[PDB]
Design an enzyme around this catalytic site. Structure first.
Site, PDB file in Angstrom:
ATOM      1  N   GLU A  33     -10.219  -3.919   9.366  1.00 43.91           N
ATOM      2  CA  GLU A  33      -9.191  -3.809   8.118  1.00 43.91           C
ATOM      3  C   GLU A  33      -8.263  -3.911   8.750  1.00 43.91           C
ATOM      4  OE1 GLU A  33     -11.809   0.094   7.392  1.00 43.91           O
ATOM      5  OE2 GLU A  33     -11.672  -1.209   5.857  1.00 43.91           O
ATOM      6  N   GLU A  75      -9.367  -8.901   7.898  1.00 49.81           N
ATOM      7  CA  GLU A  75     -10.946  -8.617   8.915  1.00 49.81           C
ATOM      8  C   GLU A  75     -11.681  -7.754   8.498  1.00 49.81           C
ATOM      9  OE1 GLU A  75      -8.422  -7.159  10.414  1.00 49.81           O
ATOM     10  OE2 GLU A  75     -10.607  -7.224  12.123  1.00 49.81           O
TER      11      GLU A  75
HETATM   12  C1  LIG Z   1     -11.366   3.460   9.206  1.00 49.27           C
HETATM   13  C2  LIG Z   1     -10.306   2.343   9.986  1.00 49.27           C
HETATM   14  O1  LIG Z   1      -9.477   2.606  10.284  1.00 49.27           O
HETATM   15  C3  LIG Z   1      -7.959   1.978  10.874  1.00 49.27           C
HETATM   16  O2  LIG Z   1      -7.089   1.833   9.920  1.00 49.27           O
HETATM   17  C4  LIG Z   1      -6.794   2.287   8.775  1.00 49.27           C
HETATM   18  C5  LIG Z   1      -5.633   4.009   9.774  1.00 49.27           C
HETATM   19  O3  LIG Z   1      -6.033   4.073  10.174  1.00 49.27           O
HETATM   20  C6  LIG Z   1      -4.974   3.694   8.526  1.00 49.27           C
HETATM   21  O4  LIG Z   1      -3.736   4.562   8.481  1.00 49.27           O
HETATM   22  C7  LIG Z   1      -4.682   3.076   7.247  1.00 49.27           C
HETATM   23  O5  LIG Z   1      -3.180   2.136   8.073  1.00 49.27           O
HETATM   24  C8  LIG Z   1      -1.979   1.903   7.324  1.00 49.27           C
HETATM   25  C9  LIG Z   1      -0.853   2.130   8.488  1.00 49.27           C
HETATM   26  O6  LIG Z   1      -1.351   4.176   8.491  1.00 49.27           O
HETATM   27  C10 LIG Z   1       0.131   1.912   8.041  1.00 49.27           C
HETATM   28  O7  LIG Z   1       1.529   2.469   8.572  1.00 49.27           O
HETATM   29  C11 LIG Z   1       0.186   0.547   7.754  1.00 49.27           C
HETATM   30  O8  LIG Z   1       0.705  -0.435   9.096  1.00 49.27           O
HETATM   31  O9  LIG Z   1      -0.918  -0.053   6.530  1.00 49.27           O
HETATM   32  C12 LIG Z   1      -1.783  -0.117   7.830  1.00 49.27           C
HETATM   33  C13 LIG Z   1      -3.358  -0.437   6.701  1.00 49.27           C
HETATM   34  O10 LIG Z   1      -3.167  -0.147   5.412  1.00 49.27           O
HETATM   35  O11 LIG Z   1      -5.199   2.563   6.793  1.00 49.27           O
HETATM   36  C14 LIG Z   1      -6.412   1.207   8.262  1.00 49.27           C
HETATM   37  C15 LIG Z   1      -7.292   0.367   7.088  1.00 49.27           C
HETATM   38  O12 LIG Z   1      -6.751  -0.520   6.805  1.00 49.27           O
HETATM   39  C16 LIG Z   1      -8.728   1.045  12.017  1.00 49.27           C
HETATM   40  O13 LIG Z   1      -7.720   0.470  12.697  1.00 49.27           O
HETATM   41  C17 LIG Z   1     -10.229   0.293  11.079  1.00 49.27           C
HETATM   42  O14 LIG Z   1     -10.605  -0.810  12.277  1.00 49.27           O
HETATM   43  C18 LIG Z   1     -11.249   1.595  10.372  1.00 49.27           C
HETATM   44  N1  LIG Z   1     -12.064   0.134   9.898  1.00 49.27           N
HETATM   45  C19 LIG Z   1     -13.677   0.984  10.867  1.00 49.27           C
HETATM   46  C20 LIG Z   1     -14.700   1.573  10.071  1.00 49.27           C
HETATM   47  C21 LIG Z   1     -15.723   1.334   9.037  1.00 49.27           C
HETATM   48  C22 LIG Z   1     -15.914   2.129   8.406  1.00 49.27           C
HETATM   49  O15 LIG Z   1     -17.593   3.221   9.138  1.00 49.27           O
HETATM   50  C23 LIG Z   1     -15.595  -0.353   8.806  1.00 49.27           C
HETATM   51  O16 LIG Z   1     -15.751  -1.038   7.421  1.00 49.27           O
HETATM   52  C24 LIG Z   1     -15.027  -1.019   9.901  1.00 49.27           C
HETATM   53  O17 LIG Z   1     -15.200  -2.698   9.951  1.00 49.27           O
HETATM   54  C25 LIG Z   1     -14.017  -0.487  10.954  1.00 49.27           C
HETATM   55  O18 LIG Z   1     -13.406  -1.102  11.555  1.00 49.27           O
END
Ligand SMILES: C[C@H]1O[C@H](O[C@H]2[C@H](O)[C@@H](O)[C@@H](O[C@H]3[C@H](O)[C@@H](O)[C@@H](O)O[C@@H]3CO)O[C@@H]2CO)[C@H](O)[C@@H](O)[C@@H]1N[C@H]1C=C(CO)[C@@H](O)[C@H](O)[C@H]1O
Length: 674
Positions: free
Chosen positions: A428, A425
């Site tokens: 992310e 969603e």
């Molecule tokens: C920017 C984004 O940060 C967070 O999500 C990212 C994680 O920080 C990354 O490390 C990576 O996560 C992976 C784990 O490391 C891995 O061990 C496994 O569990 O798979 C994960 C997924 O690949 O990638 C993540 C992104 O999918 C944070 O949780 C997320 O909410 C943040 N997104 C925000 C930022 C923006 C940009 O302004 C918007 O597009 C979103 O709506 C926000 O929620």
């Protein structure tokens, strides 16, 4: 053109220097010339220049540029941590900044004027040192430049040259060169290793410059003493280039220009842009203009349309200076919202430019990847259906029916092929049936059909709308629980792991948030249903969810109301004294305060308190961060400025004036909510 003389008399010793980090994500201001010629961006934090970008908005080359003052006897205070900083812009319609840093011990005062050269790739900082107590002769001023060329602090090469009898501190890595120069020259210079023999360490051990290295490679810091007796007010310039000659020449050109002339040219260029936007019968305020400028300054100058999410590296002062994209990456979702702000402001050109960028992205990737570098190369690879739908929605609103074959059709076909369930969603982190994502999918497919008809593709149009109607009708059945543990147990949940919102299903929350049953998690993102015109604001299911959301994740701060993204969110600092490193506690998002404001407007209510709340969440520089603390309502060390939050403020501010959701696609509204 010019005569350059490079010398290597004394090479710094004991390399390669200690590991460094990036700067604090909390920014006092950000800026760049409002033209595509000057490819230089800067940010300010803790009273000093933080990251500086060149030649692209996703290429940070600097960590800091700060002052260190001493009496040459006892104390050695770092302005970024021992002085109170006050920031203010040159004017309400320019991204120029004036910083006034006053020593916590009222001994000195440093005032800075910061902006860029509208004609060349250089950053300018006019500074004047004042001795609050004692004589200026009792103090020594030192400048500390911390280079991190091409997104990395390690292995930076530093040396000194002389261009036309002008001592410039050079720094290089790969094809990027920076030149540090002074209008009154340097009383002394040195290029040492970080935390080993750099200016900072030298001053802590001698209370005055002792080393004078003119060469080093690794984590380096280019230090230089400012000759106060020669002039207490000087001008520092940082120039960029793909070579020593270019960089040095650019520095000379800027220094050879009249300061006030460059300053006014910078201010006027931005003032011109502001005066091109809607002022809403003289209602437009400073935050409005500050927000729009910041958005305007978030586009890459080579790959036009590539608007990044934020010109910062969240919790950067807690991450190793390795190559990271931070938030200076392009997300289809964030850009979409930023595009809507431009639309509401009257700058349809920027919005279209961003749409064309998305078209490019789709052409290169066959679809919209989670996010990408400005080049269009994917950074992460999650499958977010809302990001596949948003560009279609924007195409409709911008009436760009010419992008049907290259943008709309391919994205719509993709959506129908894998929807309605999503890889993840909008936050992310998790897949399943999300009301916010499905809202975007239904709105996207509806817009796709409209554009298909415009292109006389009635077959696709029919296929698109039928799918949109089917999915629109399944939203409640897939995401609305009537067996929830919260409140009266009736509400939209954050996300259903399977085709039954009433069933028991365990989900794993990211960032160490833990494991819970799907029915336990609520998310204000459900309001996207009404925002997009998929559900009516007065729909009892909407009202029921609102009750549960406000009972579980709403916090009234001393700055106003805000919400968490969802219960158990772990994306934030674990405590008040610890930075985020992968697992912590999610905090309050002023972005969501605005979103609630937009819902209230759709519900025919006054959103003024929500407009005011966002204004108060903004810092002294008028910058809005991604998250704020619950107890004070002050910015956390999360990304700032969060362009999406600024876009939301603009749309909310305007919508509250026009008394209507300015970014809601009418076609969708009239078919499902009207
Ligand atoms: C920017 C984004 O940060 C967070 O999500 C990212 C994680 O920080 C990354 O490390 C990576 O996560 C992976 C784990 O490391 C891995 O061990 C496994 O569990 O798979 C994960 C997924 O690949 O990638 C993540 C992104 O999918 C944070 O949780 C997320 O909410 C943040 N997104 C925000 C930022 C923006 C940009 O302004 C918007 O597009 C979103 O709506 C926000 O929620």
């Amino acid at each position: 053109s010019i005569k350059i003389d490079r010398f290597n008399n004394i090479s710094a010793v004991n390399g390669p220097g200690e590991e460094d980090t990036w700067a604090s994500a909390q920014k006092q201001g950000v800026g760049t010339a409002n033209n595509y010629v000057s490819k230089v961006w800067f940010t300010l934090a803790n009273g000093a220049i933080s990251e500086v970008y060149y030649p692209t908005i996703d290429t940070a080359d600097v960590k800091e540029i700060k002052f260190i003052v001493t009496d040459g006897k006892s104390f050695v205070p770092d302005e970024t941590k021992d002085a109170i900083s006050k920031v203010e812009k040159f004017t309400d319609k320019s991204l120029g900044y004036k910083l006034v840093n006053t020593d916590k011990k009222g001994r000195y005062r440093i005032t800075k004027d910061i902006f860029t050269d509208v004609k060349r790739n250089s950053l300018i900082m006019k500074a004047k040192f004042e001795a609050l107590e004692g004589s200026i002769h009792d103090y020594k001023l030192y400048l500390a430049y911390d280079p991190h060329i091409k997104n990395q602090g390690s292995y930076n090469e530093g040396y000194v040259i002389k261009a036309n009898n002008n001592e410039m501190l050079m720094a290089k890595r790969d094809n990027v060169y920076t030149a540090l120069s002074s209008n009154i020259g340097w009383k002394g210079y040195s290029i040492g290793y970080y935390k080993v023999n750099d200016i900072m360490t030298d001053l802590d051990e001698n209370k005055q410059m002792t080393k004078h290295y003119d060469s080093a490679r690794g984590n380096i810091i280019e230090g230089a003493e400012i000759d106060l007796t020669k002039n207490s007010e000087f001008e520092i310039v940082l120039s960029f280039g793909q070579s020593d000659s270019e960089a040095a020449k650019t520095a000379l050109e800027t220094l050879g220009e009249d300061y006030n002339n460059l300053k006014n040219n910078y201010i006027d260029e931005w003032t011109k842009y502001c005066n091109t936007l809607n002022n809403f019968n003289g209602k437009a305020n400073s935050l409005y203009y500050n927000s729009m400028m910041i958005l305007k300054a978030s586009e890459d100058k080579t790959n036009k349309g590539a608007y990044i999410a934020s010109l910062s590296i969240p919790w950067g002062d807690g991450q190793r200076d390795d190559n990271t994209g931070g938030y200076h990456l392009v997300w289809s979702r964030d850009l979409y919202h930023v595009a809507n702000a431009f639309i509401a402001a009257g700058d349809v050109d920027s919005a279209n430019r961003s749409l064309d960028y998305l078209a490019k992205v789709v052409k290169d990737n066959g679809m919209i990847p989670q996010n990408t570098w400005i080049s269009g190369k994917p950074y992460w690879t999650g499958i977010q259906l809302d990001e596949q739908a948003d560009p279609i929605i924007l195409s409709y609103r911008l009436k760009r029916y010419d992008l049907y074959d290259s943008l709309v059709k391919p994205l719509a076909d993709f959506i129908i092929k894998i929807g309605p369930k999503t890889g993840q969603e909008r936050w992310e982190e998790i897949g399943g049936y999300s009301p916010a994502t499905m809202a975007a999918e239904v709105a996207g497919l509806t817009c796709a059909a409209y554009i298909a008809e415009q292109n006389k593709d009635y077959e696709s149009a029919q296929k698109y709308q039928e799918k949109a109607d089917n999915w629109q009708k399944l939203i409640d059945n897939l995401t609305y629980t009537e067996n929830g543990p919260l409140g009266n147990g009736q509400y939209y949940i954050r996300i259903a792991g399977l085709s039954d919102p009433d069933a028991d299903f365990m989900i794993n929350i990211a960032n160490g948030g833990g494991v819970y049953d799907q029915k336990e998690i609520v998310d204000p993102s459900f309001l996207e249903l009404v925002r997009l015109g998929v559900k009516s604001a007065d729909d009892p299911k909407i009202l029921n969810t609102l009750k549960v959301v406000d009972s579980t994740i709403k916090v009234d701060t001393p700055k106003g109301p805000s919400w968490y993204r969802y219960n158990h969110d772990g994306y934030g600092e674990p405590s008040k004294t610890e930075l985020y490193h992968g697992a912590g506690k999610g905090r309050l998002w002023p972005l969501l305060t605005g979103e609630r404001g937009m819902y209230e407007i759709a519900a025919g209510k006054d959103a003024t308190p929500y407009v005011k709340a966002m204004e108060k969440f903004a810092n002294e520089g008028g910058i809005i961060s991604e998250q704020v603390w619950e107890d004070t309502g002050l910015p956390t060390d999360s990304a700032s400025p969060l362009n999406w939050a600024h876009a939301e403020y603009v749309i909310l501010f305007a919508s509250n004036i026009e008394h209507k959701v300015l970014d809601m696609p009418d076609i969708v509204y009239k078919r499902y909510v009207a």
